[PDB]
Amino acid sequence: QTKEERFNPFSWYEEMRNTAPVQWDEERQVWDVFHYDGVKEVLEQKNIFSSDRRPQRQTALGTSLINIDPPKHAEMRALVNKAFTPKAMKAWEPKIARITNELLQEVEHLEDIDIVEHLSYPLPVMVIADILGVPIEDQRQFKDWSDIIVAGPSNNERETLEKLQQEKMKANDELETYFYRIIEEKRTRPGDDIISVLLQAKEEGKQLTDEEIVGFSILLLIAGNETTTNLISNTIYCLMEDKASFERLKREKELLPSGIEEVLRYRSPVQALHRIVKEDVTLAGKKLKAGEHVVPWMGSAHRDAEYFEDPEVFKIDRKPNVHMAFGRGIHFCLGAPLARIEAKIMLAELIDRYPQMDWSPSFELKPIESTFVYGLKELLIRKNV
Ligand code: HEM
Ligand SMILES: C[C@]12CC[C@H]3[C@@H](CCC4=CC(=O)CC[C@@]43C)[C@@H]1CC[C@@H]2O
Numbered sequence: 001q002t003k004e005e006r007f008n009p010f011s012w013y014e015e016m017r018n019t020a021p022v023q024w025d026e027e028r029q030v031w032d033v034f035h036y037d038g039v040k041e042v043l044e045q046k047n048i049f050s051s052d053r054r055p056q057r058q059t060a061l062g063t064s065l066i067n068i069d070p071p072k073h074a075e076m077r078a079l080v081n082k083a084f085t086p087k088a089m090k091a092w093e094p095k096i097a098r099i100t101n102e103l104l105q106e107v108e109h110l111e112d113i114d115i116v117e118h119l120s121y122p123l124p125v126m127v128i129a130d131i132l133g134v135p136i137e138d139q140r141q142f143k144d145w146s147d148i149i150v151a152g153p154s155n156n157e158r159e160t161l162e163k164l165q166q167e168k169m170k171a172n173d174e175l176e177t178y179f180y181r182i183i184e185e186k187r188t189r190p191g192d193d194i195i196s197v198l199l200q201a202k203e204e205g206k207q208l209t210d211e212e213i214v215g216f217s218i219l220l221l222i223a224g225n226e227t228t229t230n231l232i233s234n235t236i237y238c239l240m241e242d243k244a245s246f247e248r249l250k251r252e253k254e255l256l257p258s259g260i261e262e263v264l265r266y267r268s269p270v271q272a273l274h275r276i277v278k279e280d281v282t283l284a285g286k287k288l289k290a291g292e293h294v295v296p297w298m299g300s301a302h303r304d305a306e307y308f309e310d311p312e313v314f315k316i317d318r319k320p321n322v323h324m325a326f327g328r329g330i331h332f333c334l335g336a337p338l339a340r341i342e343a344k345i346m347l348a349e350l351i352d353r354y355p356q357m358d359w360s361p362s363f364e365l366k367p368i369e370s371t372f373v374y375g376l377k378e379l380l381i382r383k384n385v
Contacts (some may be wrong), residue, residue: 128224
């Protein structure tokens with residue numbers, strides 16, 4: 001399938017919603033769930049559809065929020081919830097604006113810029129590194145590691161697969177090794193960051209192993225390299241694709257939060273997730289069995305015509321917009337407030353500064369090679385100042 005099509009899975013989504021919104025895929029050995037209500041039930045019904053990824057060695061990543069079920073999930077989420085509320089995140093608006101204007105300043109001398117390299121990717125890893133309290137100087141190791149962990153394979157063969165899994169194991173092992181070192185440093189001289197806050201809470205007897213702190217830290221770091229960058233760049237993509245939306249947005253700046261919500265629906269940074277059936281369940285007439293894997297495609301739910309009038313049309317003012325781009329239920333994204341404010345601040349600045357931006361003459365579509373993570377490796381824009 002050409003790159004063009006891998007950036008447009010929405011035709012396959014449509015085809016499945018209108019034939020079998022829940023179906024077992026022999027090749028990939030999963031139940032695909034494509035319709036809105038099904039994606040919602042899968043994500044919500046945590047006692048039916050489990051988040052525990054059972055591999056034969058567990059990783060620290062496998063003990064973090066995203067891979068644990070109740071009761072362990074609520075106790076662990078509770079320790080970190082207050083650090084990521086919309087109010088907690090208002091303190092960071094000024095740092096984000098400063099970081100945005102710093103990065104913009106560095107490529108001011110360029111007529112043509114890569115949104116991804118110069119803007120959408122640096123800002124979120126700089127925030128997450130300040131949140132974790134690790135040296136931004138390691139950003140290259142952070143991206144290479146995070147890229148492996150979210151990477152997808154070229155094909156479904158047993159030997160391309162087997163070799164990717166090997167790289168992910170090595171990258172987990174090196175990510176763990178790295179953070180165990182950080183954890184010792186921060187026991188010696190703590191800092192103002194969430195690794196210390198967690199360590200301070202383990203001091204005080206909260207049920208918390210150092211492996212659990214490492215895993216959470218790795219989850220955050222990976223989120224800081226592989227999510228908000230695609231919201232921002234995918235937003236610019238939609239605005240360059242439909243210049244009518246871009247012209248309206250420039251005239252009505254108050255539409256930017258709404259426009260970012262519609263990008264979340266329409267070019268979702270995360271197209272799907274993974275669950276495991278805990279006990280036999282029936283779902284749209286299909287007989288799901290204990291232990292089978294399930295893939296709810298939020299990207300497809302987001303085009304479901306019964307919930308989104310004219311699903312195929314990008315509407316910056318879309319109302320209602322009840323998307324599940326950040327999930328649904330007890331695992332709903334922890335960084336959603338942070339993501340929303342990182343995107344608003346950098347996008348507003350970009351649009352204010354380069355109202356005549358357009359595709360660079362060397363632009364090429366370069367979709368990310370992943371099945372879940374959805375975005376572009378590169379987005380070359382001509383400023384036209
Ligand atoms: C546009 C940006 C983002 C998108 C689209 C996104 C998407 C998601 C989704 C769909 C989930 C649900 C996972 C599941 O149910 O398996 C999730 C969970 C999570 N997200 Fe994000 N994310 C984004 C940014 C961030 C950021 C910036 C952070 C942290 C700094 C973050 C941290 C987390 C964490 C820790 C969880 C696990 C919560 C739990 O399991 O209780 N995300 N994210
Ligand atoms: C990519 C993935 C689905 C999306 C997840 C990812 C782990 C890191 C993560 C942090 C988030 O905020 C949700 C999206 C992502 C990016 C998962 C690892 C295996 C699965 O394919």
